[PDB]
Symmetry: none
Subunit: 89 residues, 2 copies
């Protein structure tokens, strides 16, 4: 079974300085990322939205939407009824 965080962690050392900044953010704040727009991430990291998109496409074919989808699989499931579902994105 694939694991996007495993991939990013192990590819990380060969990324550019800017790619590393974005990747480290993803690895360190994977929960926060899934409910952020690319523009929001860019402002937080003092980079461009485009850069967030390009690194997303580098690590997964479907880019930013797919990165968030994939991340969400490794986040906590949410309670459906308080007497479970995939984490939101």
């Amino acid at each position: 079974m694939p694991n996007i965080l495993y991939k990013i962690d192990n590819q990380y050392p060969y990324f550019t300085k800017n790619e590393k900044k974005i990747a480290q953010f993803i690895l360190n704040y994977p929960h926060k990322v899934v409910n952020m727009t690319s523009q929001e991430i860019a402002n937080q990291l003092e980079t461009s939205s485009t850069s967030i998109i390009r690194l997303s496409k580098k690590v997964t074919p479907g880019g930013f939407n797919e990165l968030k989808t994939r991340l969400s699989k490794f986040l906590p499931k949410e309670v459906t009824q308080y007497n479970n579902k995939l984490h939101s994105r």
Copy 2:
């Protein structure tokens, strides 16, 4: 300021299967947790009280009781006097 739920949410993906079970319960039922013992949580989750204590110490140095103290800061405050608030109990 620090936020223990923020920490657990963002560390969660790298935890072991058992740690994730415990952490998901804390994240999903944080109010329920503050008035449970580690043995009660263990029985709910079909795991060991020691594993609850270990996960607690992993996320906060004071362990299980400190976990509950920190959680209580993010729970509703309770009414001190009913006249026609205080830190949530632990």
